């Protein structure tokens, strides 16, 4: 009786479809209204639904009725009708081919909640399943109307909406921009800090994540308080919510170096470094890396919330995984210079057993980016005299010199970039770590015993001021000892240093004048 009354009511429908149509076309506003109501009730019956779904003229008349109507009821009805229809692929293609998207979009401007709900839901289905729906919605001007709807308060509505926003924003610049232009960041953030409906929060974060790769939304989201809002969820049970915020947080990170009030975030991140999830730890390490770049208040705060230990432990546990070690090490480098807490951090790395693992990263497999970072970190650690011996005993000096030599030979055979890093950096970096390392008499002996003097002198003839600086600088530290001083003089440093006196670089000239003096100083 169920497969007997289907084709019955269905056929019976094909019997009234055509008339109902003509009625919606009727001029008498009231005739139409009533007709819409009838078509609406009809779309509830799966039987009829297929009859409308197959009558292009009916659909087109429903769409038309919806957009031109002024009856809050006709609106709700025609809107619903399209919705009920939007559940089948033919309904999608129908609604599509008959210009329903633009009408639906216009409806997103309705004050009638029921209508809005229908409209946004129809569109959603269209976005998810109708080929060509996305670009159509972009052309109709939907994004603005959608961001404007973020003003609503029905979580389930917002859920859909943001997901529409997400679907249209993924990989599309004009869209990302329009969302931005329409104050999307501020709306999205607000959601993040106000509601607690998992699905919504997750979806909203997926939108933010998509926007975070945009050069123009990045700062906006930050300025909108995005870092902190996003931070609020790093503890949620939903691993998917957490991971999306972490990702989004990392993309925003470079644009958030001047942000204030980050304690909590900086705090949580440090904690997360102890996760079991590699993706979590990675992101955390990455974020901390950027957030501690040239922001002294941030550095100070991290050191004070157990960051050094955390970072050290991470680097330890990460082993060969450079996706974790480079940002982690960079963080540690950042934390060990230019701020009142640097000294503490310098001893902290040691007192937590990091020196070994750190010196080790200077060796293969470690890649250039990582080595560069490690060299830099070792230089800072060397600022603390309580690190000279320990650091020496880890065989760092021999190795730095090795990297210095080879890299420098490379910068020479390129006269007659690698993994991004350019050897000239490794030259400056290594010579620099030897310069700060050359502060310990025992180290001065080692550096000297590796037959490095002749090379250092050669570096004075370098065109790069910074290299000139560290070369002259390490030379100055060595030259404070007679034999050394003369060995240097004997290498012909006297000539080049002399001219390095007329150097525009204060430090460079000083070091020069210092050696020239140390040499002749009987």
């Amino acid at each position: 009786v169920n497969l007997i009354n289907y084709q019955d009511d269905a056929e019976l429908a094909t019997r009234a479809i055509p008339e109902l149509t003509k009625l919606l076309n009727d001029e008498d506003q009231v005739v139409v209204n009533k007709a819409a109501v009838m078509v609406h009730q009809l779309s509830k019956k799966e039987a009829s639904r297929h009859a409308i779904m197959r009558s292009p003229q009916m659909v087109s008349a429903i769409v038309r009725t919806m957009q031109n109507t002024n009856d809050v009821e006709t609106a709700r009805c025609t809107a619903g009708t399209l919705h009920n229809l939007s559940h089948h692929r033919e309904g999608l293609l129908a609604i599509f081919k008959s210009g329903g998207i633009p009408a639906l979009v216009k409806m997103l401007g309705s004050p009638v909640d029921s209508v809005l709900f229908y409209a946004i839901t129809t569109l959603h289905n269209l976005l998810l399943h109708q080929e060509g729906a996305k670009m159509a919605v972009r052309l109709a001007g939907g994004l603005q109307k959608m961001v404007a709807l973020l003003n609503k308060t029905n979580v389930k509505f917002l859920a859909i909406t943001t997901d529409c926003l997400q679907i249209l924003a993924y990989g599309n610049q004009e869209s990302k921009l329009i969302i931005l232009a329409s104050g999307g960041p501020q709306a999205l953030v607000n959601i993040m800090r106000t509601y607690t409906y998992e699905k919504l929060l997750w979806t909203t974060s997926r939108v933010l994540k998509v926007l975070s790769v945009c050069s123009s939304n990045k700062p906006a989201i930050v300025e909108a308080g995005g870092m902190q809002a996003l931070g609020l969820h790093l503890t949620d049970p939903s691993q998917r919510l957490v991971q999306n915020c972490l990702w989004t947080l990392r993309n925003l990170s470079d644009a958030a170096t001047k942000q204030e009030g980050m304690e909590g975030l900086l705090g949580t991140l440090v904690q997360l470094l102890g996760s079991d999830d590699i993706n979590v730890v990675t992101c955390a390490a990455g974020i901390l890396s950027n957030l501690t770049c040239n922001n002294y208040k941030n550095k100070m705060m991290v050191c004070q919330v157990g960051g050094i230990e955390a970072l050290v432990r991470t680097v330890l546990r990460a082993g060969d995984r450079e996706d974790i070690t480079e940002p982690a090490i960079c963080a540690l480098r950042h934390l060990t210079s230019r701020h009142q807490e640097a000294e503490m951090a310098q001893n902290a790395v040691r007192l937590h057993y990091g020196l070994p693992v750190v010196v080790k990263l200077l060796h293969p497999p470690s890649h250039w980016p990582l080595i560069k970072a490690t060299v830099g970190l070792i230089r800072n650690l060397a600022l603390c005299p309580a690190n000279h011996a320990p650091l020496r005993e880890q065989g760092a000096i021999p190795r730095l010199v090795q990297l210095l030599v080879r890299a420098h030979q490379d910068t020479q055979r390129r006269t007659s970039f690698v993994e991004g890093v350019r050897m000239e950096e490794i030259v400056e970096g290594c010579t620099g770590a030897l310069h700060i390392l050359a502060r310990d008499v025992h180290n001065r002996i080692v550096i000297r015993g590796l037959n490095t003097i002749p090379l250092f002198v050669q570096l004075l003839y370098s065109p790069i001021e910074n290299i000139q600086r560290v070369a002259a600088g390490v030379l100055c530290e060595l030259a404070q000892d007679k034999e050394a001083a003369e060995a240097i003089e004997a290498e012909g440093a006297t000539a080049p240093l002399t001219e390095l006196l007329h150097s525009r670089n204060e430090g460079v000239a000083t070091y020069a004048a210092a050696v020239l003096f140390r040499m002749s100083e009987d």
């Binding site: 993309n251 960079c330 230019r338 000083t510």
Partner: protein, 57 residues
């Protein structure tokens, strides 16, 4: 992608005295002037910024 060095937004620290005559004092001229070059915050290594851009799929 690739990292980008960032100049240290100083809080002001430069201070190198000019080489005085009376060579009998150009010797300590360096000692103090040297302590300055070793202090100089405007010298590498600089902090660096990596720019992540994971959009997902």
């Amino acid at each position: 992608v690739t990292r980008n060095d960032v100049a240290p937004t100083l809080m002001s620290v430069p201070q190198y005295r000019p080489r005085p005559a009376n060579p009998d004092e150009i010797g300590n001229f360096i000692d103090e002037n040297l302590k300055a070059a070793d202090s100089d915050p405007t010298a590498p290594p600089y902090d660096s910024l990596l720019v992540f851009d994971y959009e997902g799929s």
